[PDB]
């Protein structure tokens, strides 16, 4: 197996067993300066040199056995960064190990980091830093074998201003005043469980905590600590359910971190410290499905990981499957089917957006000369789940397939696998149903673009109310607009209301009078629920309602979740009345946007 996203030496040549990170965080220069001690094991005889992944890194020196050795940075290869060859002071035999201390310093243009000014935070007093290494941004923080095929434990000592707090994707290991600087603190961290390097995370800021479980603290600025602790109160309940589905939780502590609005994703599953968007603070725990998702990743993604990014569906596909199983335990089987069916609708949207023949709509992709951030979508999430949901109904139901999953997690625990690894074990587990498995169009499910060859069976109980009301609006005439009222939503949950907008959005645009009437009777402008508002504003913009232009521009910039920001900007760019505003608003905010988010929105707006 070849990782076409990495320029480092493959796992067949050498493997990094441990990392010791000793660095200091300079907010004045916006740089990370320190040393990275990599314990590397040779996988072949007579190993004299190895290559590492770097990206906008400044290398001072390389120390092995107390003496400096010769190193060389090759030319940059765009998004992959610059390869770093290191000359070993001794030829290594197989399984032989050495420790390599690399003195490095990050660039302010680190694609893995976003530096926030005090004004960009809640407290307005202190600066802020958070990392995002998924998929291949860890090289922009430190020199490494930036590949998920290599797992590694790590320890870290991080120096930050004494009035600030540092947190990493590891177990907290005490804090002390910096002996070299009285104005700073040193936070120590330890990760005893081997992780892929993309799971390395760091956050520095005026953070506070509040315990909500025996092994869970919620971290954020003081302004959001209390709201977050309430919003995520179901965390421990979800952990207990997840443990019952995938086996014991092996990370010891599961803390949550609520980041500033510019956090690119809904959630990052960093071990011991899950990163989440503040747009989950709906006030009624209604977006806690994301928490169940990130929790589930502790088994599918963190324990059994994809060997390359071509098999990324292994991570999210199974994780969504566990996620919706957790919500199934909490709110019933009909609720699980509700989210499952809605997820198919999301798959419909992604395929239609890319194209029926677009390579990014394949379950297993080919990221050769392809920036992973560009290819990222809901396809591996939903098509992956669609396959597993299809296999569930095909092999005897949920209880039986949940048996496979637990065996699957235990079989490939602490290991990196491929799709064929998964498929072979599937046939191995269900050996008495190989005739059933052979009826599966594997080539279409795994390697063919567009919608899956077959649609799973979904319960329609909670969805019927959505379809009924949406069809009313879509097929509505002018003398049907008056009969609409606020009573139409009396028996609709927040999820049903959101699905209603999702269904209606698929047939956008609607007549402008329909949308105006909809605001008059439903008052959707008053809803702060990010998911509901996002689809409501998209419906308005696509239906050419100029009144929603400042509202869409506001939400697109007051938060940075690419799930919301990117479709909002594109819709605003497709609307002639707001095209100039959209491009201008982007240009005025791009310097302060997340580096990855700023790049992608630029491509979407075609202002690159
Ligand atoms: C969340 O950060 C990322 C970005 C990109 C990838 C790679 C990928 C994307 C889509 C389909 C298959 C593989 C993985 C993680
Ligand atoms: Zn995920």
Author numbering: 3 to 610
List passages from the publication reporting this PDB structure.
As shown in the M1 metallopeptidase HEXXH-(X)18E motif, the Zn2+ ion was coordinated with H295, E296 H299, and the carboxylic acid side chain oxygen atom of E31826. Our interpretation is that the Q136 side chain maintains the catalytic water molecule interaction with E296 while simultaneously engaging in multiple hydrophobic interactions via its rotational freedom. The loss of water molecules could afford more favorable binding entropies for nonpolar ligand binding, provided steric clashes are avoided. Also, the structural data suggest that nonpolar ligands are likely necessary for enhancing the peptidase activity due to more favorable binding entropies in the active site. Hence hydrophobic interactions and steric considerations are the primary factors influencing what modified kinetics may be possible.
